Scaffold this active site. Structure first.
Site, PDB file in Angstrom:
ATOM      1  N   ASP A   1      -8.860 -34.572 -21.393  1.00  0.00           N
ATOM      2  CA  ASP A   1      -8.728 -33.446 -21.263  1.00  0.00           C
ATOM      3  C   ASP A   1      -8.622 -32.144 -20.570  1.00  0.00           C
ATOM      4  O   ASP A   1      -9.967 -31.831 -20.193  1.00  0.00           O
ATOM      5  CB  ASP A   1      -9.138 -32.840 -22.693  1.00  0.00           C
ATOM      6  CG  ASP A   1      -8.556 -31.380 -23.369  1.00  0.00           C
ATOM      7  OD1 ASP A   1      -7.486 -30.901 -22.749  1.00  0.00           O
ATOM      8  OD2 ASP A   1      -9.315 -30.955 -23.958  1.00  0.00           O
TER       9      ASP A   1
ATOM     10  N   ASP B   1      -2.163 -29.286 -18.796  1.00  0.00           N
ATOM     11  CA  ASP B   1      -3.056 -29.651 -19.975  1.00  0.00           C
ATOM     12  C   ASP B   1      -2.839 -31.067 -20.732  1.00  0.00           C
ATOM     13  O   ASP B   1      -1.809 -31.151 -21.368  1.00  0.00           O
ATOM     14  CB  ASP B   1      -2.991 -28.551 -20.985  1.00  0.00           C
ATOM     15  CG  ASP B   1      -4.038 -28.749 -22.052  1.00  0.00           C
ATOM     16  OD1 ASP B   1      -4.724 -29.790 -21.942  1.00  0.00           O
ATOM     17  OD2 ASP B   1      -3.985 -28.100 -23.169  1.00  0.00           O
TER      18      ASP B   1
END
Ligand SMILES: CC#C[C@@]1(c2cc(NC(=O)c3ccc(C#N)cn3)ccc2F)CCOC(N)=N1
Length: 375
Positions: free
Chosen positions: A36, A222
């Site tokens: 992440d 992201d």
């Protein structure tokens, strides 16, 4: 240049993100961890939530150390709360090193873990600034670089689709994972991986918006988000143009809102009616930009679980532009932390057809790129 041990170290299911294998504690406890780049905590399940395959058992680790500090992270959907500690952390299919890292031991959560998924924690690869509870909690990668001779860089090849895969090259670049050249955009500020979009094109047609709108209030890269999320005003303009370009077929208003699926007979999806999407990013040099281009194969996500269907994965946002998996699956992306820049290159694994390919092209001349950033 070549890190054969780390090639193919990512697994996942379509829609559920990319995870890497990690070990925590002594003796090593194996866990699957979501990669992440949109967060900064190493946060692992540590209690027997029914959805989880495995979880961190602190009682079993001789190297565990309590920080005697709790963390509570709410959001609009639900929450996670944990207990902060440190322990020895290693990545089996990564660098041959062992690091004392911060671990948030998750002890209660809501709408955080996915039911049916094969991961039980999140590796936040972004910067200390956005770490919970505050920037004093040193992120994993910061600890890895500080405690070893692993170069301050990692790269991600996320390979789209039911079983997705990819590579996280930690401390370097593997030139086999991409074609052509890498093009670099500056990391505007070290909190999220923040970048500046200077221009947006739908099938070569400029959206003609004040480029500040593209970055309102930020643009980020992201891997912990599926969609290409666009600021409200931009999303509006972009779907209008995608509709016009694809007007050969009509679709219900709910499809463009992600509220509804559209289905074609197997193997007959008309990719050709859907336009490419180009984002121009700030370049390394004054007045220089470059362009990244994705296909409908990236933004129309296959949905296996119905009772050939697809979801539109460009969506409106109030948190700015998020370049999620919809962008990253087209590219090999280099998070060059040492030089405060992010590199993009055509991914050797991206999904395309015989007519069109994802592309990274430059240089282009763009003026006033600094005015595109939001303050
Ligand atoms: C701490 C943390 C965190 C989160 C977070 C991310 C996720 N990701 C996913 O489930 C996911 C990720 C990728 C793909 C794909 N493809 C599909 N699914 C789940 C829970 C979270 F709390 C908050 C929201 O945004 C980001 N960046 N990190």
């Amino acid at each position: 240049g070549s890190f054969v041990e780390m090639v193919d170290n990512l697994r996942g299911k379509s829609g559920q993100g990319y995870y890497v294998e990690m070990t925590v504690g002594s003796p090593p406890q194996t866990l699957n961890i979501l990669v992440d780049t949109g967060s900064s905590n190493f946060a692992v399940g540590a209690a027997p939530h029914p959805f989880l395959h495995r979880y961190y058992q602190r009682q079993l680790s001789s190297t565990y150390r309590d920080l005697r500090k709790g963390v509570y992270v709410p959001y609009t959907q639900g929450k996670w709360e944990g207990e902060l500690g440190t322990d020895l952390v290693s990545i089996p299919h990564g660098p041959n090193v062992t690091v004392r890292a911060n671990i948030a031991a998750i002890t209660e959560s809501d709408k955080f873990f996915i039911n049916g998924s094969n991961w039980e924690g999140i590796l936040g690869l972004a910067y200390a600034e956005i770490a919970r509870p505050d920037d004093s909690l040193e992120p994993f990668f910061d600890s890895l670089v500080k405690q070893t001779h692993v170069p301050n860089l990692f790269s991600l090849q996320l390979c789209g689709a039911a079983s997705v895969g990819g590579s996280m090259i930690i401390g370097g670049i593997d030139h086999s994972l991409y074609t052509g050249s890498l093009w670099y955009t500056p990391i505007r500020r070290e909190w999220y991986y923040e970048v500046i979009i200077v221009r947006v094109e739908i099938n070569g047609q400029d959206l003609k918006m004040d480029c500040k709108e593209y970055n309102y209030d930020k643009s980020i890269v992201d891997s912990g988000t599926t969609n290409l999320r666009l600021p409200k005003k931009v999303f509006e303009a972009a779907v209008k143009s995608i509709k016009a370009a694809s007007s050969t077929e009509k679709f219900p208003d709910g499809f463009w809102l992600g509220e509804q699926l559209v289905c074609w007979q197997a193997g007959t999806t008309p990719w050709n009616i859907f336009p490419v999407i180009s984002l121009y990013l700030m370049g390394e040099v004054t007045n220089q930009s470059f362009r990244i281009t994705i296909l409908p194969q990236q933004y129309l996500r296959p949905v296996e679980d119905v009772a050939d269907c697809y979801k539109f994965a460009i969506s409106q946002s109030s948190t700015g532009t998020v370049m999620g998996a919809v962008i990253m699956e087209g590219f090999y992306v280099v998070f060059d932390r040492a030089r405060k820049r992010i590199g993009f290159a055509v991914s050797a694994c991206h999904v395309h057809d015989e007519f069109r390919t994802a592309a990274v092209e430059g240089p282009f001349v763009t003026l006033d790129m600094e005015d595109c950033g939001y303050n």
